[PDB]
Write a protein that binds this ligand. Structure first.
Ligand SMILES: [Cl-]
Lengths: 106, 97
């Protein structure tokens, strides 16, 4: 019954691919201290290669957040540590708004 | 060293959410029998910031991916995919470390 949020990340203007990757790594390390957050993952898009193609913009990385329940999410939203982590994501890894996903079973 | 492919999925024109979710579930059930594929996951997009679902494939290594690509069973799985995926955006991901 996990809550899951997925972010499509675009590299901020003015930084190299190397800096971006390092900012993503740091963002991952910082996630371990964020209250309410069960798990975080960030991966680079390495490639963007028989069913019609779907045109969306260029994406550089993907971030995903897991929350155990609504209570955890509330703690996460009220947390100053979470807030500082968002500022880092926003400014340095291009975090905008996430897709909220749901399981396909019942 | 696991290979991971992510897919943004859009449902076919005119298909109901009901049928799309059911076909995603069928697709997930079929995934357990596909050679070379270690794990598959498909989730619906409940809220966006239009993508209807996100799919993800895991392969243990290049050889597993080679096995998968050469499989007739995988080809049949893909034919099923054509039943409920109108458009698709694939991505190969990598770790940031
Ligand atoms: Cl806090």
């Amino acid at each position: 019954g996990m809550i899951r949020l997925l972010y499509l990340l675009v590299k901020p203007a003015g930084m190299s691919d190397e800096t971006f990757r390092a900012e993503c790594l740091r963002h991952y390390e910082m996630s371990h201290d964020v209250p309410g957050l069960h798990k975080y993952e960030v991966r680079l898009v390495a490639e963007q290669p028989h069913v019609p193609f779907f045109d969306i913009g260029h994406v550089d990385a993907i971030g995903e957040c897991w929350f155990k329940d609504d209570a955890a999410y509330a703690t996460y939203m009220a947390s100053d540590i979470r807030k500082a982590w968002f500022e880092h994501g926003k400014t340095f890894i291009g975090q905008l708004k996430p897709f909220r996903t749901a399981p396909v079973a019942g």
